[PDB]
Design a protein around this ligand. Structure first.
Ligand SMILES: Nc1ncnc2c1ncn2[C@@H]1O[C@H](COP(=O)(O)OP(=O)(O)O)[C@@H](O)[C@H]1O
Ligand SMILES: Nc1ncnc2c1ncn2[C@@H]1O[C@H](COP(=O)(O)OP(=O)(O)O)[C@@H](O)[C@H]1O
Ligand SMILES: Nc1ncnc2c1ncn2[C@@H]1O[C@H](COP(=O)(O)OP(=O)(O)O)[C@@H](O)[C@H]1O
Ligand SMILES: [Mg+2]
Ligand SMILES: [Mg+2]
Ligand SMILES: [Mg+2]
Lengths: 372, 394, 152, 7, 372, 7
């Protein structure tokens, strides 16, 4: 097999698989748990560290560390274990055989790209590699050359407009506000009912709550008075110990931070204004093409009601003449990987790689020239 | 006392100690523990001199705890047993403490942050129905810790018996997105001191013996500036070993249990708590703030509560912060540390600052009507009277 | 239990770089030129003829207490400690009784310095000296050895 | 508390 | 005192003072900060809004709004607070007593002049007023009647040639590219090192960095390779929290946008071509007089190396016969105000005013006739 | 990050 490999390396998840395939082969969380007690039972596979789903199975006795935060890698020692867990254990392939396609958010520090490319060669001995923008890959899977992508993951949220394969970097915007900032906000408001979640493991439980009961309100202030009057939104959730909780108002107050970050204290503007303000920075000619081809990506865009609230708010700002059409496919949680298998399966792409010899002569700084 | 003669009262209603008094007071009138004790028969004890009521409260319970099964109504800032909490409020408003008439008085109260709402609604529901207080206010423990210190800007550290919370303020502008709670306080220490004394063979399983270990903690236990130096003293010498005589005459001996128990405020994993201590949390709360405000937080760190009264805590806290400033801000430049300006306000009256601040805000607002919450307002609106404070309730 | 976060900040010690550390004073006038101390030829020429009691006072007259240098102190100690070791055990009370108070205290300082590094029979003598100087000077002589911030 | 911790 | 008042009202700063004086009495930024939290400490001078240096002192808890953007006033309610803060608090004078001289950039919408004159009379009850072009005042302070001025401020950059007091409006050119567009560009490239500045307060910090460490490169491509080889340009900056940063290449990439706006995506030409293309629109006879009397103004022209790079580029375009002489006085950050105190101190100017009665009969449209 | 935000 000479198929290229693709790795997303999001803030929360690691989506991996082969090129040419339609969906990733391995999906696991980007966490590395180290125990918090002393294991005295000997000969029982008691390892110094656990990775991926093997940690979530043992989260009770571990401290879960997300090595990535807001897109940046904070711990490179742990991140080697992630990739090592991806190739050898999940995909069950050597990396020196195939190439790999990595991803990265825009407006990240250059030292993050310099280190990844340094690691794929000097550590894993890959033959070549490449580093793409996450939003751009989402459009390849969408089958377009015109449209603005809004990828919202676990740590980062960024907009990227393109027009006929010509990206406008002056209009790209980033916003460090994503699911992990929402998960933490949910744990702060759940105290109002009487539910306390502090531990990292308890943070993963609340993640499962967020992605099962939280929806977006088309009108926040209207549904605010609905819950005050009735008990229709009061859904329940069963904790693993058997306890039971109930959340009403807290289902749509969590994702509203995307549209009102002032709850989190952040001075920034909502995603509904960010993607709009990005479009206003593009040329006056191509705005209409992007109002129609407005695409969403990332797991954070899987809330129900997210497409209707964006369409509502965008219409209110933009002129009444322009027609706002949101694109929200039912696989937008993996769109960035799907485009990667597409982009690596192309004949034109076989020259954009950064081979072993090119890194040997230019060093890791070649990534800035080769990879845009 | 207000213009109309109505006494203005300030009750902290803490988790381990009640601090009740009147506005403008520079001390509190009465400081007694928040426990209720019912009678009990035990074979070891024999007493028939002092009358033991069916419901003893406060200082007359803790003094007679040998003949009682005491129980704390409040735990971690939250109220568990209301029927035992009202018997405490009565004692607080009765002929034994603050012999006042509730119908002709104003009251100021406190709740810690990020607590449930039903614990606040149910208190106000009680003050207007049961006691029918004329005017009520529910203050924030952080803002009061500044009034007593005479400030408008300062990160607060308020550690008590059940709760340890951190609330930054900047020129009177609340920043609740930075409020943090550590789940460790004087009760989680008192348990850890029993689990350590158990190695020496001393067993304190009963509910009365829980107070006896609190007194052992308040007297002996302390905090180590450099924990390595303290461990040398316990390995090389035997000077830390003190002695405490119990009510039953039995004598015990306490050594390295003096700095190991309260170290759980800085090394909290010793009591099975995942996270970081009060110093690395206070440094991370600040590093979350806006970059221009950080410079004035380091200068105005304010302590409070009685779990900050361990000998050596502020010095230990100043130390651990400068280690982190050096390590993460300055990246290891010792030469720049001389310019790092940090001042930890550790006044020895920090045991009651949540109350003193309540005396100060009451005397300032005793004679205003848009401040308090009236019985008439609660009859009309109900629990929605709290919207005056900005607390969204229906 | 165990922790799983970086706890390396608690290892560095900031108290070393402190500004409130104590600073004791020294004699500025002695740093440039040190006191010459008891010259060996003076005492020695008095030892050749056997005049011990006068070589005795010659060694206690000069004493480089104000000197920051340690060699002249060490040379001074070896001189007086050479003198005390050559005395006749019956003559010591005759010599100790001659001294004023301020010489008995300086003597007991040199005595507690001879015990640091003894020869074969340097200490059986100094214990006899210690008995006499204590009979005159009492415990208060020793306290002015402990409290003395300036070594002999 | 009601869920998590006792209180 | 019957001395006339002068007010610049730039996009970033408000320079104020009396006529006849040599330097302005009050200089403060044109910002209006409103708090982002709820002030519960009562009786503590907690105002609804702050203005000027009182905001920069409290920027941490505020959202700084520049009411002016690219020369135009976007918020007139806030701009009254600016003028009200100028007269009553800074200058400590009533405006009805003295007249006032305002300024404005060329090719602005007429509604901006109509509103200022409406505000000075109907709100402040001034006796008269006048509205001058900013570039023209710079030449009065320069002591000339022949020369082309290039005023570059915080929001606007415009060229104005004059010949013997006869202005050529057909040759005036404007360029919406100035310090605030450079400050934003600096915050985008600083991410490459790993420094993130998003908040408005953090935008003011970066302003202080820009005006302390950024210089102009006589040859951009040459110094680009200098920094890649050595570490000589690596200067450092101390943030108020005590953190420290270091910037090399980013010191001359920020102001180069003035000479290469393609970094910002703008299709426009650099200032070095704008002032040249303006001269080429003048008569063939008077070009030589303007090549010599080439003046700079505005705070944006205070970079070191700006005069030498303009002289270099202008020489390369213009013929070798013409001698290029740049004029860059050490007070060019206040030249536009200095000329205003001059122009109002003249006897000939006492008739060019627009009195109260003239506005009463003709309305605010008189400004188009009186004020050129 | 190094300055601004944690990472
Ligand atoms: N059904 C869902 N509803 C709401 N949020 C979801 C859902 N599924 C995933 N998420 C969120 O999406 C995030 C992961 O998004 P994804 O882009 O797939 O990976 P990454 O964010 O690491 O790039 C998680 O942090 C999670 O909170
Ligand atoms: N000398 C002392 N040393 C250490 N802790 C003390 C001392 N005195 C009192 N304490 C502690 O202070 C706690 C009470 O703090 P406080 O905030 O006043 O009450 P609450 O915790 O109810 O709010 C008690 O739990 C007690 O353990
Ligand atoms: N020393 C300096 N170096 C570089 N730029 C400066 C300097 N001083 C001021 N500036 C810039 O000049 C601008 C203000 O220019 P000025 O003309 O005085 O006011 P305005 O631009 O509002 O008319 C600011 O936006 C600032 O970035
Ligand atoms: Mg993603
Ligand atoms: Mg308390
Ligand atoms: Mg200007």
């Amino acid at each position: 097999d000479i198929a290229a490999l693709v790795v997303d390396n999001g803030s929360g998840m690691c989506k991996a698989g082969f090129a040419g395939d339609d969906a990733p082969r391995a999906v696991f969380p980007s966490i590395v748990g180290r125990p918090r007690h002393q294991g005295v039972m000997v000969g029982m596979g008691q390892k110094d560290s656990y990775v991926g789903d093997e940690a979530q199975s043992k989260r009770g006795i571990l401290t879960l560390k997300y090595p990535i935060e807001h897109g940046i890698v904070t711990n490179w020692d742990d991140m080697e274990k992630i990739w090592h867990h991806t190739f050898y254990n999940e995909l069950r392939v050597a990396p020196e055989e195939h190439p790999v396609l990595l991803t990265e958010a825009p407006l990240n520090p250059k030292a993050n790209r310099e280190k990844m490319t340094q690691i794929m060669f000097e550590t894993f001995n890959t033959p070549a590699m490449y580093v793409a923008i996450q939003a751009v890959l989402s459009l390849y899977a969408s089958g377009r050359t015109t449209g603005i992508v809004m990828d919202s993951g676990d740590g980062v949220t960024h907009t990227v407009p393109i027009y006929e394969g010509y990206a406008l970097p002056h209009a790209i915007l980033r916003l460090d506000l994503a699911g992990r900032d929402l998960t933490d906000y949910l744990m702060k408001i759940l105290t109002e009912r009487g539910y306390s979640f502090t531990t990292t493991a308890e943070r993963e439980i609340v993640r499962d709550i967020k992605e099962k009961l939280c929806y977006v309100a088309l009108d926040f202030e209207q549904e605010m008075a609905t819950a005050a009057s009735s008990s229709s939104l009061e859904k329940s959730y069963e904790l693993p110990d058997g306890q039971v909780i109930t959340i009403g108002n807290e289902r749509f107050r969590c994702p509203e931070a995307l549209f009102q970050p002032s709850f989190l204290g952040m001075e920034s503007c909502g995603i509904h204004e960010t993607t709009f303000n990005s479009i206003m920075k593009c040329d006056v000619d191509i705005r209409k093409d992007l109002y129609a081809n407005t695409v969403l990506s990332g797991g954070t865009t899987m809330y129900p009601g997210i497409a209707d609230r964006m369409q509502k708010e965008i219409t209110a700002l933009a002129p009444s003449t322009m027609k706002i059409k949101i694109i929200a496919p039912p696989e937008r949680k993996y769109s960035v990987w799907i485009g990667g298998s597409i982009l690596a399966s192309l004949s034109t792409f076989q020259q954009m790689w950064i081979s072993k010899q090119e890194y040997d002569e230019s060093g890791p700084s070649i990534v800035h020239r080769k990879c845009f | 006392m207000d213009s109309q003669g109505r006494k203005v009262v300030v009750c902290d209603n803490g988790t381990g100690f009640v601090k009740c008094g009147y506005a403008g007071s520079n001390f509190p009138e009465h400081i007694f523990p928040a426990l209720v004790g019912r009678p009990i028969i035990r074979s070891t004890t024999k007493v028939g001199n002092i009358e033991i009521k069916d419901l003893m409260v406060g200082d007359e319970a803790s003094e007679l705890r040998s003949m009682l099964e005491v129980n704390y109504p409040m735990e971690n800032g939250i109220v568990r047993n209301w029927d035992d909490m009202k018997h405490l409020w009565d004692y607080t408003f009765g002929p034994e403490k603050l012999n006042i008439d509730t119908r002709n008085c104003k009251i100021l109260l406190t709740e810690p942050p990020m607590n449930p709402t039903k614990n606040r609604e149910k208190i106000v529901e009680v003050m207007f129905e049961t006691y029918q207080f004329s005017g009520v206010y529910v203050a924030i423990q952080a803002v009061l810790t500044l009034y007593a210190q005479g400030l408008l800007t300062g990160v607060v550290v308020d550690s008590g018996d059940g709760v340890t919370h951190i609330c930054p303020v900047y020129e009177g502008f609340s920043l609740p997105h930075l409020t943090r709670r550590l789940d460790i306080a004087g009760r989680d220490i008192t348990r850890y001191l029993i689990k350590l004394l158990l190695l020496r063979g001393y067993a304190f399983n009963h509910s009365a013996d829980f107070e006896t270990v609190r007194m052992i903690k308040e007297k002996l236990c302390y905090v180590g500036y450099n924990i390595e130096q303290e461990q040398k003293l316990a390995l090389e010498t035997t000077v830390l070993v003190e002695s405490y005589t119990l009510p039953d005459g039995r004598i015990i001996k306490v050594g390295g249990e003096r700095f190991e128990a309260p170290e759980a405020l800085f090394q909290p994993h010793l009591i099975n708590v995942e996270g970081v201590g009060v110093a690395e949390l206070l440094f991370n709360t600040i590093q979350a703030a806006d970059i221009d405000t950080r410079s004035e937080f380091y200068k105005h760190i304010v302590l409070s509560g009685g779990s900050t009264m361990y000998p050596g805590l502020p010095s230990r806290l100043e130390r651990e912060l400068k280690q982190l400033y050096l390590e993460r801000v300055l990246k290891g430049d010792v030469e720049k540390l001389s310019k790092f300006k940090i001042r930890i306000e550790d006044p020895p009256r920090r045991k009651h600052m949540v109350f003193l601040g309540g005396a100060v805000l009451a005397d300032i607002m005793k004679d205003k009507d848009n401040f308090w919450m009236t019985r008439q307002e609660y009859q009309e609106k109900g629990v929605r009277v709290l919207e005056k404070l900005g607390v969204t309730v229906r | 239990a165990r922790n799983t976060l970086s706890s390396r900040f608690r290892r560095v010690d900031i108290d070393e770089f402190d500004e409130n550390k104590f600073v004791d004073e020294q004699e500025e006038a002695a740093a440039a030129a040190a006191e010459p101390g008891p010259d060996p030829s003076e005492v020695d020429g008095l030892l050749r003829q056997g005049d011990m009691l006068r070589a005795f006072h010659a060694a206690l007259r000069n004493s480089p207490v104000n000197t920051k240098n340690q060699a002249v102190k060490e040379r001074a100690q070896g001189v007086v400690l050479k003198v005390l070791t050559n005395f006749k055990s019956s003559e010591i009370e005759q010599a100790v009784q001659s001294l004023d108070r301020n010489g008995v205290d300086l003597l007991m300082k040199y005595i507690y310095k001879g015990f640091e590094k003894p020869t074969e029979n340097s200490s059986a003598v100094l214990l006899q000296w210690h008995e006499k100087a204590l009979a005159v000077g009492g415990l208060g002589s020793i306290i002015r050895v402990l409290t003395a911030r300036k070594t002999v | 508390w009601x869920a998590x911790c006792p209180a």
